[PDB]
Nucleic acid binder design. Structure first.
Ligand SMILES: [Mg+2]
Ligand SMILES: [Mg+2]
Ligand SMILES: [Mg+2]
Ligand SMILES: [Mg+2]
Ligand SMILES: [Mg+2]
Ligand SMILES: [Mg+2]
Ligand SMILES: [Mg+2]
Ligand SMILES: [Mg+2]
Ligand SMILES: [Mg+2]
Ligand SMILES: [Mg+2]
Ligand SMILES: [Mg+2]
Ligand SMILES: [Mg+2]
Ligand SMILES: [Mg+2]
Ligand SMILES: [Mg+2]
Ligand SMILES: [Mg+2]
Ligand SMILES: [Mg+2]
Ligand SMILES: [Mg+2]
Ligand SMILES: [Mg+2]
Ligand SMILES: [Mg+2]
Ligand SMILES: [Mg+2]
Ligand SMILES: [Mg+2]
Ligand SMILES: [Mg+2]
Ligand SMILES: [Mg+2]
Ligand SMILES: [Mg+2]
Ligand SMILES: [Mg+2]
Ligand SMILES: [Mg+2]
Ligand SMILES: [Mg+2]
Ligand SMILES: [Mg+2]
Ligand SMILES: [Mg+2]
Ligand SMILES: [Mg+2]
Ligand SMILES: [Mg+2]
Ligand SMILES: [Mg+2]
Ligand SMILES: [Mg+2]
Ligand SMILES: [Mg+2]
Ligand SMILES: [Mg+2]
Ligand SMILES: [Mg+2]
Ligand SMILES: [Mg+2]
Ligand SMILES: [Mg+2]
Ligand SMILES: [Mg+2]
Ligand SMILES: [Mg+2]
Ligand SMILES: [Mg+2]
Ligand SMILES: [Mg+2]
Ligand SMILES: [Mg+2]
Ligand SMILES: [Mg+2]
Ligand SMILES: [Mg+2]
Ligand SMILES: [Mg+2]
Ligand SMILES: [Mg+2]
Ligand SMILES: [Mg+2]
Ligand SMILES: [Mg+2]
Ligand SMILES: [Mg+2]
Ligand SMILES: [Mg+2]
Ligand SMILES: [Zn+2]
Lengths: 138, 124, 83, 104, 208
RNA sequence: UGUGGACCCGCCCCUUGGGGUGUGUCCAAAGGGCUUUGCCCGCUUCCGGAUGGGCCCGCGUCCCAUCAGCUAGUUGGUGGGGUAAUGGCCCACCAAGGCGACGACGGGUAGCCGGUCUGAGAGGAUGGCCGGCCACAGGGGCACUGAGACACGGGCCCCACUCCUACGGGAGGCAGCAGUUAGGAAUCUUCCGCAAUGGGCGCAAGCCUGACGGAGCGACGCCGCUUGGAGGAAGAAGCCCUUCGGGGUGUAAACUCCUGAACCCGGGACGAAACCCCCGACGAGGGGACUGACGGUACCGGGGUAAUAGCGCCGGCCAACUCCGUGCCAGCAGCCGCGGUAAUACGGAGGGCGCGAGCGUUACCCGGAUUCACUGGGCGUAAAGGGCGUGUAGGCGGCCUGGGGCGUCCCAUGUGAAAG
C-alpha cells in the first residue's frame, strides 16, 4: 500500500518532469488536490484536472518546462527544479508562524497545512499561522 | 538508521583515549630513575637514543626520553616528566623535563634554551 | 524580620549600594525580595540617589525595618515627609 | 491547578485502589517524531466504583499512602479491555526477553 | 613610541613607505631611496611567489605597523569593530584613526605617530581642556584636542605648529594653529584615507 | 476575669481537615524605666499582614543490558501511634499486592542550577570565582532545648586517633580566618580595621562581629603603561656572507637637540551621616556635634635622570636562509619525516619571521570532525544486510463524510530572581 500518498505525488511529478512528460496522473485525494492548487497558482504546473482512469479517480497534472535550449543537450530547463517532502510519517514536522522557513530567499515556496488550510509560506505567514511543513518547492 | 531507530538507540558518543596516562592527567609527574639505558630507533633510523625507566609518583613505571645533547641521569636520580611521544621509539610516550630536579639543563646551548632548561648566558 | 537596607554592588574603592528589601538573615549581597533604589556614596554622578517613595512606603507599612543608613537615605528622598 | 490526567484501569486486584495507565505524546527532544510514553498511577477508590477497562480521569490529591497521591475523579467511558489487553500481553511478553526460556 | 628599533627596516619589508619618522621620510634618505628591497642578507634575492597566506599576513602587518600598535591592541580593536554595525573594514579604520596619539599626528602637533605618542604620554596634550596621557584614548566627535597650555612654548611644539600654518588638514578634522586647538569633526570614511592597505585582506587574515 | 481561642456533639454554608453557629468543658498575662502620678520599653489571648519554611504532584536530569528480573513494610486496606502537617513515617491486624525492555534491580561515576567555554547553528564540554538550592562538620547512631537544630566552634553512646593522667579516669575535633605539617606538577599574610555596608544583643550609650571593608604575597587572568622623541653616511668599528668587486646588520650606533618613567619636595582627598543631642510631639520638619582601616594612599602642583628585553620559531603544512661544525653519529621530530661529507630539518653563528612583559611547553575542553551525521553520513566490490523464514511487542498506514480537539497552530495572560 502507499505509505505516504503526498510523498508519492511529489515524486510522480519529480519523475515525470525529469523525462519531460506532457503530464502525469496521481491517485485522487482532496488533500493532494489542495496542494496542486498551490503548484498551479504559483506557476510550477500548467494546472491539473480530475480524470477517471480505468474506473478510478485520478488527477492529471499538466507539467511545465522552459524553452528548448542551445548547444549539447537542448533539454528545457525545469520549472520545478526541486520538490521535496519535509514532514513525513515516521517524522512529522510542525512549525510555528515564527519558524516558517524562507525557501531560496523567496524564489521558492513551502507548502504547509494549517488549521486555516493548505498555504504557501508567504500566505500562512500573512494569515499569521503555522502548521505542518508539508513540502518545499523551487 | 530510520528515525525510529535513532529514537530507540540514539547515537553513541565516542570516547577520547588518553595518550599519556601520566595519571590524574596532571601536566607533569615526578618520578625516580631506575634504569638509564640506550635504545635503538626503528624504521629508517639508527642511533643510541637516550632513555630512562621512571618509577612514577602516580604509582606508574614508565620509560621517558631524555632530550638534549648529553645528560647526567643516574640509575637513581629524581626527575620530572611532561609527556610527549618519541615517534622513533615505540613505547616511549613521555619526555623528561630537562632543568628540573636532578636533571641538569643542557650546557652550552644557545638556541632553544627555554626547552632543555638552560639559563641565559652572560656577555660583555 | 524583613529589612530595607543597603547591598554592596560597586567594585573595590568604588562602592555602589543597592537599596533593597530583604530578610534580615540573608547575606547582605544575597537574594533580596525587591530593589527599591540605589545610592552612590561618592556621588560620582548627579544621580547618586534614587528611591521610589511609593514602594519604600509599601514595605514600611507591612513591617520592613530600615537600617539607620537606610532610613537616612529614604528620608532624604522624602519617604517620611508628610507636609 | 491539581493536575488532572486520564487513563485506563489496568489493575483491580487492590482494596480501595485502582491502577490507571496514563499515556502522553510528545515530540522527541532531538529526533522530532511524536513518541508515546506511558505511566501507571495508583489512584484512590473509596467505594471500589471502577473496574478494568474503565477510562477514568485522575486528579492530583493529598497523599493517601506511599505511591497514592491521586484519586479517581470521574468515569469517561467504560468497558474496553482492548486497552487492558495491550498492557497484559506486553506484560506477558516479558517471559521471552530474559535469560531463562519462556513460551512468551 | 612602540616596537623600539629600526623603523625604516619595516617600510623596507613592506615595500611601501609607511611614512613614520617625519622628515627623512621625504628627503632622499628614507632608505626606500637607493634601497627599496627588504632587509637582511637575502633582501635582493629574487623573491619567490608569495603565498595566499603570506599576502594577508603582510597586509595586516603593514596596517598595524603604520599606527605603531601592538597585536594585542590591534586585534582587540578589530574584534570590537567586527561585532559592531557597519562595514568592519571602515569601522576598523575609523577606530584606529580615533586613537588620541593618532589624532595628534593628524593635527600636526607631532611630525610622526611615535612622537605624537610620546607627547600624549608626557602630558603635553589635552582633550576638552583636561590632560589625557593615554595614546589609546578614544577621541569622539566634538572633542577639542589642544596642546597643554604649559607646553605651548616648547621648542618642538613651536616649529611643528609653525609648519602647520597655511597647511591643510584632514576633512574630518580642523585646527586653529593660533590657540593650538584641534577638533575631531567626525569619524573618517574609507574614502578620506589614503592608506597603502587593502583592509579586505586584513578581515580575511582574521578568519583563517 | 474569657475579648477571644481550643476540643467533643449538633445544625448551616462551603466541600477532602475551609467558614459560621449553639450548648458543655478547657486556656491568659511580667514586670521594668524615667526628661514620673504620664509617657516609654515590655507581658497576655486572638484575627490578619509580611517574611522565612515543611510536605506533595506533572515534566526534565550521566555510563554499562557482559547488570533481567526486583520486592514482603514489600503494594494496598482498617485501626492506632507520631508530627506543625499528608503519608507504611512507625506499629498491630487483614488483603496479595507493587515494579520492570516506554530498562525495574544491580554496578560505575557525579552535589544540581543561574551560568561558563566552544560552535554558523543544532550541539559538545563544563558547574572554579559570584548568586540560588541541597548536603555534610573525625566515621556511625541518637535525641534534648527551642518559633526554628536532630544543631561545625551544644549534649549522649559506640569506633579510629591525639592529649593529660596519682591508670581509677579524663580532654579534644580549622570542610571559620590566618598559619603548620603531609600529599602534590601546584595554590598566599600566623597582616590592618570594625571608618563603611550587613548581622546579634541593648531604651541608649555601646559591646561583639577573621561577615565584611582594606592592605600583603604570586605576571595566575584581564586592561592600561614604560624601556624614549626628532635629526644623523650611499653609510664607522666589530661580527658577517662574498663570483673578493662588494653584500648584510643600519639610521641601527656614535653624536646633536627635545621630552622626562623613576626618584625628590609641597599640598592632600571622596568614601561620613547617621545613630546621638537640642528645637519641635521621643512624630514630620529644622539645627548641631562625633566619627577613616585604606593613608600622607589616590589625585593636584613644583623639581628632575634617556632610563629593563625577552621568548619561540625560519624543510612542507606555516610567516622567515645563509655559512660552519657534525657524517644513520650526535641528535631533531605535532603529522609528514630529517641525519650514512656540498644538511635552508641536528649544533652554533650571522641574518630573518612572529609575539613582546612575556614567550614557549605539558595537560585538559570545544572547533575544524557532516569522524554518531537531528540540522548533517552510510552498508554490491572501501567498515557495514541479519543464513532463511514465521511471527509477538512496537513503528508505520488507502479513498469519502461526520463528531471530538489529544498531538499541532493561533491570541491573551502569568512565570522566566539578581549576576552574566
Ligand atoms: Mg604532544
Ligand atoms: Mg628545535
Ligand atoms: Mg614641565
Ligand atoms: Mg573557523
Ligand atoms: Mg468567650
Ligand atoms: Mg465541610
Ligand atoms: Mg464547625
Ligand atoms: Mg462552638
Ligand atoms: Mg510602671
Ligand atoms: Mg511477586
Ligand atoms: Mg494507617
Ligand atoms: Mg493525624
Ligand atoms: Mg500482612
Ligand atoms: Mg541504576
Ligand atoms: Mg563525589
Ligand atoms: Mg555563546
Ligand atoms: Mg558542527
Ligand atoms: Mg550552548
Ligand atoms: Mg548545561
Ligand atoms: Mg573552590
Ligand atoms: Mg556559588
Ligand atoms: Mg533546608
Ligand atoms: Mg578532618
Ligand atoms: Mg520542642
Ligand atoms: Mg571549628
Ligand atoms: Mg612535596
Ligand atoms: Mg561594623
Ligand atoms: Mg553596624
Ligand atoms: Mg633614533
Ligand atoms: Mg557608632
Ligand atoms: Mg520635648
Ligand atoms: Mg534630623
Ligand atoms: Mg637612550
Ligand atoms: Mg620546520
Ligand atoms: Mg614559508
Ligand atoms: Mg658526534
Ligand atoms: Mg655541513
Ligand atoms: Mg647529503
Ligand atoms: Mg641552519
Ligand atoms: Mg560532530
Ligand atoms: Mg562514511
Ligand atoms: Mg566488505
Ligand atoms: Mg541476504
Ligand atoms: Mg545466525
Ligand atoms: Mg490516514
Ligand atoms: Mg496505529
Ligand atoms: Mg476527524
Ligand atoms: Mg488540542
Ligand atoms: Mg504561553
Ligand atoms: Mg514577566
Ligand atoms: Mg536575569
Ligand atoms: Zn621611512
Amino acid at each position: 500500500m502507499l505509505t505516504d500518498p503526498i510523498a508519492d505525488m511529489l515524486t510522480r511529478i519529480r519523475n515525470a518532469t525529469r523525462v519531460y512528460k506532457e503530464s502525469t496522473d496521481v491517485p485522487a485525494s482532496r488533500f493532494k488536490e489542495e496542494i496542486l492548487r498551490i503548484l498551479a497558482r504559483e506557476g510550477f504546473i500548467k494546472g491539473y484536472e480530475r480524470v477517471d482512469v480505468d474506473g478510478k479517480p485520478y488527477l492529471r497534472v499538466y507539467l511545465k518546462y522552459g524553452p528548448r535550449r542551445q548547444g549539447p543537450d537542448p533539454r528545457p530547463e525545469q520549472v520545478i527544479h526541486h520538490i521535496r517532502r519535509i514532514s513525513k510519517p515516521g517524522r512529522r514536522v510542525y512549525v510555528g508562524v515564527k519558524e516558517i522557513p524562507r525557501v531560496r530567499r523567496g524564489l521558492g515556496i513551502a507548502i504547509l497545512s494549517t488549521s486555516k488550510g493548505v498555504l504557501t509560506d508567504r500566505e500562512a505567514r500573512k494569515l499569521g499561522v503555522g502548521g505542518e511543513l508539508i513540502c518545499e518547492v523551487w | 538508521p530510520t528515525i525510529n531507530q535513532l529514537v530507540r538507540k540514539g547515537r553513541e558518543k565516542v570516547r577520547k583515549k588518553s595518550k599519556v596516562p601520566a595519571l590524574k592527567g596532571a601536566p607533569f609527574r615526578r618520578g625516580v630513575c631506575t634504569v638509564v639505558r640506550t635504545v635503538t630507533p626503528k624504521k629508517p633510523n639508527s642511533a643510541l637514543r637516550k632513555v630512562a625507566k621512571v618509577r612514577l609518583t602516580s604509582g606508574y613505571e614508565v620509560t621517558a626520553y631524555i632530550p638534549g645533547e648529553g645528560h647526567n641521569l643516574q640509575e637513581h636520580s629524581v626527575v620530572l616528566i611532561r609527556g610527549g611521544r618519541v615517534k622513533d621509539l615505540p613505547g616511549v610516550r613521555y619526555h623528561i623535563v630537562r632543568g628540573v630536579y636532578d636533571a641538569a639543563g643542557v650546557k652550552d646551548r644557545k638556541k632553544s634554551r627555554s626547552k632543555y632548561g638552560t639559563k641565559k648566558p652572560k656577555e660583555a | 524580620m524583613v529589612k530595607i537596607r543597603l547591598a554592596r554592588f560597586g567594585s573595590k574603592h568604588n562602592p555602589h549600594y543597592r537599596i533593597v528589601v530583604t530578610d534580615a538573615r540573608r547575606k547582605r549581597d544575597g537574594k533580596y525580595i525587591e530593589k527599591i533604589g540605589y545610592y552612590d556614596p561618592r556621588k560620582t554622578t548627579p544621580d547618586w540617589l534614587k528611591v521610589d517613595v511609593e514602594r519604600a512606603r509599601y514595605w514600611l507599612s507591612v513591617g520592613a525595618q530600615p537600617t539607620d543608613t537606610a532610613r537616612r537615605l529614604l528620608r532624604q528622598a522624602g519617604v517620611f515627609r508628610q507636609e | 491547578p491539581k493536575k488532572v490526567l486520564t487513563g485506563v484501569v489496568v489493575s483491580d486486584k487492590m482494596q480501595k485502589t485502582v491502577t490507571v495507565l496514563v499515556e502522553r505524546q510528545f515530540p522527541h527532544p532531538l529526533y522530532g517524531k511524536v513518541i508515546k510514553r506511558s505511566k501507571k498511577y495508583l489512584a484512590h477508590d473509596p467505594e471500589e466504583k471502577y473496574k478494568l477497562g474503565d477510562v477514568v480521569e485522575i486528579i492530583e490529591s493529598r497523599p493517601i499512602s506511599k505511591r497514592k497521591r491521586f484519586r479517581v475523579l470521574r468515569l469517561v467511558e467504560s468497558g474496553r479491555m482492548d486497552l487492558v489487553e495491550k498492557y497484559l500481553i506486553r506484560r506477558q511478553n516479558y517471559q521471552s526477553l530474559s535469560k531463562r526460556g519462556g513460551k512468551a | 613610541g612602540r616596537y623600539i628599533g629600526p623603523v625604516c627596516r619595516l617600510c623596507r619589508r613592506e615595500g611601501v613607505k609607511l611614512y613614520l619618522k617625519g622628515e627623512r621620510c621625504y628627503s632622499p634618505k628614507c632608505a626606500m631611496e637607493r634601497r627599496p628591497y627588504p632587509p637582511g642578507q637575502h633582501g635582493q634575492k629574487r623573491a619567490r611567489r608569495p603565498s595566499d597566506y603570506a599576502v594577508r599576513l603582510r597586509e595586516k602587518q603593514k596596517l598595524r605597523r603604520i599606527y605603531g600598535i601592538s597585536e594585542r591592541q590591534f586585534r582587540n580593536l578589530f574584534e570590537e569593530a567586527s561585532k559592531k554595525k557597519g562595514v568592519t573594514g571602515s569601522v576598523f579604520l575609523g577606530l584606529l584613526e580615533s586613537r588620541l596619539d593618532n589624532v595628534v599626528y593628524r593635527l600636526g602637533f607631532a611630525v610622526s605617530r611615535r612622537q605624537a605618542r610620546q607627547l600624549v604620554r608626557h602630558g603635553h596634550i589635552t582633550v576638552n581642556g583636561r590632560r589625557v596621557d593615554l595614546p589609546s584614548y578614544r577621541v569622539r566627535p566634538g572633542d577639542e584636542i589642544a596642546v597643554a597650555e604649559k607646553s605651548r612654548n616648547l621648542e618642538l611644539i613651536r616649529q611643528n605648529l609653525e609648519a602647520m600654518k597655511g597647511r591643510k588638514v584632514g576633512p574630518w578634522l580642523s585646527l586653529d594653529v593660533e590657540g593650538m586647538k584641534g577638533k575631531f569633526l567626525r569619524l573618517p570614511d574609507r574614502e578620506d584615507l589614503a592608506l597603502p592597505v587593502n583592509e579586505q585582506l586584513v578581515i580575511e587574515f582574521y578568519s583563517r
